[PDB]
Design a protein around this ligand. Structure first.
Ligand SMILES: CNC(=O)Cc1cccc(CNC(=O)c2cc(/C=C/[C@H]3CC[C@H](C(F)(F)F)CC3)c(OC)cn2)c1
Length: 208
């Protein structure tokens, strides 16, 4: 009954995340394709964290050791169906909270469980309508993922894409920079959506 209904905690909720591409045409007439997209403008299903330990690093900065530090209720699994049917490649995250903090946002890209690239932004808060807003908008997508996307896109069969994406994950950890306590940890596993449907997501709580 205290279990989350969306991707967030009482201390920090995710408002919106999107990874996208804007073609060069967008200047003449703006358009943008969304690979994956969560919008959050009944309890959530659950998943046993151990079942995914192997899909992420297993030493310092790994899922097993992060979950043991807790708090447990901060851990979610996002299952994406990516829309690979479609420039500037970018990503945008927006969070909210009732407390003024300075967040440190780490995004680990992982292949066969081994960290491959990592990014660590830092977002100070901006109070707006009584609640603090954290905006990491239009951040450039990392060069590894943009290449991955163009390579992934050319595989002749969708089941080959999903074969590759079985071994590709991303891990995000948002922590209070000043106190080191963790606020929200999201694990992302990927599938490619069929050509006819657009991106969708299924969010789960990570339990033990
Ligand atoms: C600044 N340039 C650098 O090189 C430094 C750097 C390193 C790592 C990550 C970033 C930016 N962060 C994302 O790019 C990012 C990307 C994603 C997801 C990207 C796509 C990748 C393709 C897949 C698909 F192939 F499955 F379609 C769909 C998701 C994400 O997700 C939480 C979270 N973050 C930047």
């Amino acid at each position: 009954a205290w279990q989350a209904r969306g991707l967030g905690t009482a201390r920090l909720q995710l408002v919106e995340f999107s990874a996208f591409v804007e073609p060069p045409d967008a200047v003449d007439s703006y358009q943008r394709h969304l690979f994956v997209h969560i919008s959050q403008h009944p309890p959530l299903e659950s998943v046993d964290v151990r079942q995914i330990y192997d899909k992420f690093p297993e030493k310092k900065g790994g899922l097993r050791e992060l979950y043991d530090r807790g708090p447990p209720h901060a851990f979610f699994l996002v299952k994406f169906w990516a829309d690979l049917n479609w420039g500037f490649y970018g990503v945008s995250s927006q969070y909210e909270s009732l407390e003024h903090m300075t967040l440190t946002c780490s995004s680990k890209v992982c292949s066969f469980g081994k960290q491959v690239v990592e990014k660590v932004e830092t977002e100070r808060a901006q109070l707006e309508d009584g609640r603090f807003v954290y905006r990491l908008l239009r951040s450039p997508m990392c060069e590894y993922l943009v290449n991955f996307l163009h390579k992934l896109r050319q595989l002749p069969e969708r089941y080959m894409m999903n074969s590759v994406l079985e071994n590709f994950t991303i891990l995000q950890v948002v922590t209070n920079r000043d106190t080191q306590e963790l606020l929200l940890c999201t694990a992302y596993v990927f599938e490619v959506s069929t050509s006819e449907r657009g991106a969708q997501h299924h969010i789960y709580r990570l339990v033990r």
